[PDB]
């Protein structure tokens, strides 16, 4: 597909946010982008001196995000031309990643109410309904890969593992894998499907209702693999309503075809809310 072309001259970097496998991410301003062409905040990913593999991954990401557009998928504005660094431009989400957001509202840090937790969950589920409709399998759904904007707006992205910060969330089972978020068939057989994404969503629900705590925090990586392989599941958080835990269990059926599908999950989460927010388009 064609990707929108942003001029390098129109981007002004303001602050560095982090670095992944695919280069540094910055808060920036961009001109000539908004309908008024007035400057607007964006996030910029910059890849310096990219290898061939990095260039290919950059192109794959740009094409994917041009094609996958939805209210709850991270919004992508375009790329700069060929050169160094390679630059990709995203919508700025001012509250950052959902895992840090959840932790900032947790007891170990006011707090988030049931309505707010369900709204976060429902928005992620909505994004996943869209991904499933495009036959896109994400493989790394987790709150660390979701962004939070104004009005508790949550969108799904994929940032990968941190380049500069120590992380406990990935383990080399080749490739680093988010094993704590994965079902038995993904760990044992590398089978990744919409159904393994549903498993991960159940783990996201657990993250939300524990304010971002790491799944299986009490277990080493080796113990996690054995635990998941042997069919143990995450325990119900004390502040988690039984109905919400029952949705998690619906995600965590050992047989993938017995799991709730994400459309079913979306409907349930929406019925579970006492006063589900109303979505408008004007």
Q: Which residues bind ligand DZ6 (CB under 6 A)?
A: 17-18, 25, 43, 45, 61, 64-65, 68, 73-74, 90, 92-93, 96-97, 138, 147, 156-160
Closest to ligand DZ6 by CB, 64 vs 268, is 64
| Residue 140: CB minimum distance to ligand DZ6, A | 7
What is the H or E stretch that residue 247 is in? helix 242-251
Quick one: tokens of 201? 């969503």
| Residue 204: CB minimum distance to ligand DZ6, A | 14
* CA nearest neighbour of 218 among 242, 205, 229, 234: 234
Q: Is 140 a catalytic residue?
A: yes
Q: How does strand 146-148 pair with strand 171-172?
A: unpaired
Quick one: tokens of 147? 């962004």
Residues at the binding site are 17-25, 45
Closest to ligand DZ6 by CB, 196 vs 227, is 196
| Residue 89: CB minimum distance to ligand DZ6, A | 9
* CA nearest neighbour of 47 among 65, 60, 30: 60
Q: What is the C-alpha radius of gyration for the chain, rounded to an integer number of angstroms?
A: 19
| Residue 170: CB minimum distance to ligand DZ6, A | 12
Closest to ligand DZ6 by CB, 91 vs 185, is 91
Catalytic residue among 10, 38, 140, 246: 140
Check: CB of residue 198 under 8 Å from CB of residue 131.
Answer: no
CB-based burial, 239-260: b 16+ in 10 Å, e otherwise: ebeeebbebbebbbbeebeebb
The three-class DSSP label of residue 226 is: helix
Residues at the binding site for ATP are 17-25, 45
List Cβ neighbours of 1 (8 Å cut-off, separation of 6 or more). Answer: 63, 66, 67
**Residues designated catalytic:** 140
């Amino acid at each position: 597909t064609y990707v929108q072309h942003i001029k390098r001259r129109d981007i002004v970097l303001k602050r560095e946010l982090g670095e992944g496998a695919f280069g540094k991410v910055f808060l920036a301003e961009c001109y000539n982008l908004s309908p008024t062409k007035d400057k607007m905040l964006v996030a910029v990913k910059a890849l310096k001196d990219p290898t061939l593999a990095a260039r290919k991954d950059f192109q794959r990401e740009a094409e994917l995000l041009t094609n996958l557009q939805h209210e709850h998928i991270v919004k992508f504005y375009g790329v700069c031309g060929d050169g160094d660094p390679l630059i990709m431009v995203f919508e700025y989400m001012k509250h950052g990643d959902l895992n840090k957001f959840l932790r900032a509202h947790g007891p170990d840090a006011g707090e988030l109410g049931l309505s707010q937790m369900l709204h976060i969950a429902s928005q992620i589920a909505s994004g996943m309904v869209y991904l499933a409709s495009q036959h896109f399998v994400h493989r790394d759904l987790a709150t660390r890969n979701c962004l939070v904007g104004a009005n508790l707006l949550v969108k799904i992205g994929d940032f990968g593992m941190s380049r500069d910060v120590y992380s406990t969330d990935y383990y080399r089972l080749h490739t680093m894998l988010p094993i704590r978020w994965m079902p038995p068939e993904s760990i044992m057989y590398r089978k990744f499907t919409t159904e393994s994404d549903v498993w991960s969503f159940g783990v996201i629900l657990w993250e939300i209702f524990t304010y971002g705590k790491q799944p299986w925090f009490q277990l080493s990586n080796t113990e996690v693999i054995e635990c998941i392989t042997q069919g143990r599941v995450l325990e119900r958080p004390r502040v988690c309503p039984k109905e919400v835990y029952d949705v998690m269990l619906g995600c965590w059926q050992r047989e993938p075809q017995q799991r709730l599908n994400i459309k079913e999950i979306y409907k349930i989460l929406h019925a579970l809310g006492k006063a589900t927010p109303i979505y408008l388009d004007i």
